[PDB]
Every structure is written in C-alpha cells, then in structure tokens.
C-alpha cells in the first residue's frame, strides 16, 4: 500500500468515524451522498469504485439496503465489506413500536446518540483490526480516545437537559429518537423515518394538535415545504438542526458538530 488501505465509506458519520479511528493511516474517501441517504441510489461509477477498493464501510442494512446486494466474489474483487453497526441494538421506529416488509420497524438514526456513536467506533476499530491486524494497536488507541470524548460530552449535557423545563421538540424528519431517549426527551418528526414520507392529512392534523398541546415553540428544520406551512397554522418559529445526514463542510470534527447541535437543542428547550 502507498498511502495505506483505500477505504470507501457510505456517508458522513461513517466517514468521520473511520477517518478518526484510522487517524493518519489510510486513504479514506466517501461516495457523494449529499442528496439523502434514505433515498440514495448509487451509480455505476460509485459501485465500480467500491469494487476497486480495499475496504467498504456502511452503517446498516436498515439504512443503505443497496449495500446488501453487493457481491465481491462473483466480480473478481477483493474488497472487504464491513457493516459498521453489526451487533448494535436498534430501537423501534416511533409510531410502529407495537407492530410485530420488516426493515421498516427499526430506526437507523443511531449515530446521533453520543454513546452509540462510540459503540460504532469500537466496532469499526475491531473490524479494521481483523482486516489490517498489524496497525490494530492504533485502531484501538484512537477508538478508545473517541469514546472518552463522547463520554466526556454526554455527562456534560446530562445536567443541562435535566434542568430543562420543556422536554418535547418537533423536527423535520424523525432522526432524533436516539438522542431524545438518551437525555429523557420526547420528540416528534413531521416526515417520519424518511424525508420522502410526507404526512397524511390526519397525521398533519395530529401534528398540529401535538404542537398546540405540548406548547412547542419552535420547529427544527433541515437546510421540506410542508414543515414551512405549520408556522402559519401554529405560530411556531424555525430554528436549524442538522441531523448530520451529510458533510457540514467545516473544520470541526464529528463530535464537535454533534456538540453544536446538542447545544442548539439545549438552548432552545429552556
Ligand atoms: Cl437522516
Ligand atoms: Zn430510482
Ligand atoms: Zn446486515
Ligand atoms: Zn458479520
Ligand atoms: Zn409499546
Ligand atoms: Zn495498515
Ligand atoms: Zn505503521
Ligand atoms: Zn443526573
Ligand atoms: Zn433521516
Ligand atoms: Zn386528534
Ligand atoms: Zn467540547
């Protein structure tokens, strides 16, 4: 290897965690997934790049289902496909919890919990240390340093959330379910598990009733149009909250961007 293993990642959380666990060791790139990860269909060029790589890392078969149809053996490729969330426990989708198509029941937005981002980093560090065992002492040392700062960041917002008077927030899509359950909050998504799941009229009426009931002052959006109409019917305000679905394109690391989003959330819920 020149620079190292040529690793390709699914989207921004996986890219950031692989780049921080690997450190200055390997050449890590990610396919262009700015346009939605839930409604992302890869091109032939991206698939050819994945087959010409050493390691491909994706989050879960519940998010990037197109990574399951990948078959490296029949295409004479040596790429090692790694599921970064193998072994993790996925909670039920809000609104489908007592349901018993089976991929729809589990929420894949598990990288926004600071603690479950840390679990993903350990799994990547172990998996990359089965694939390139010689540099394993570094994959763990860097994985162990990220979990500590994620643990350092989770015991810091615990008290801020603990003293919040309002524990309910509404978001453009249902992505903050794990983060909300982490700090004892109650969230409601307008578009649900996927931004292409626009609400039904009855669901829209129930969302209006919910905003009026729990005195939700602001609606967190992403940088959808239906979310931009409830401001009239409810009188709420529009504040930004990035679910880190894509690259923020700045100098901060992953946990720093997560810290910024949590800080916005904590300053609003007071
Ligand atoms: Cl998302
Ligand atoms: Zn299509
Ligand atoms: Zn799987
Ligand atoms: Zn496995
Ligand atoms: Zn239940
Ligand atoms: Zn190596
Ligand atoms: Zn080395
Ligand atoms: Zn406490
Ligand atoms: Zn989402
Ligand atoms: Zn009702
Ligand atoms: Zn910090």
Author numbering: 28 to 127, 133 to 255, 259 to 305
Task: Reproduce text from the manuscript describing this model.
Streptococcus pneumoniae scavenges essential zinc ions from the host during colonization and infection. This is achieved by the ATP-binding cassette transporter, AdcCB, and two solute-binding proteins (SBPs), AdcA and AdcAII. AdcAII belongs to the cluster A-I subgroup of SBPs, consisting of a conserved structural fold of two (β/α)4 domains connected by a rigid α-helix, with the metal-binding site located at the interface between the N- and C-terminal lobes (Loisel et al., 2008; Yukl, 2017).
In this study, we investigated the Zn(II)-binding mechanism of AdcAII by mutating each of the four Zn(II)-coordinating residues in the SBP. Structural analyses of Zn(II)-bound AdcAII variants revealed that specific regions within the protein underwent conformational changes via direct coupling to each of the metal-binding residues. The binding site mutations impacted protein conformation and interaction with Zn(II) to differing extents. Quantitative in vitro metal-binding assays combined with affinity determination and phenotypic growth assays revealed that each of the four Zn(II)-coordinating residues contributes to metal binding by AdcAII. Intriguingly, the phenotypic growth impact of the mutant adcAII alleles was, in general, independent of affinity, suggesting that the Zn(II)-bound conformation of the SBP is crucial for efficacious metal uptake. Taken together, these data demonstrate the importance of SBP-metal complex conformation for bacterial Zn(II) uptake.
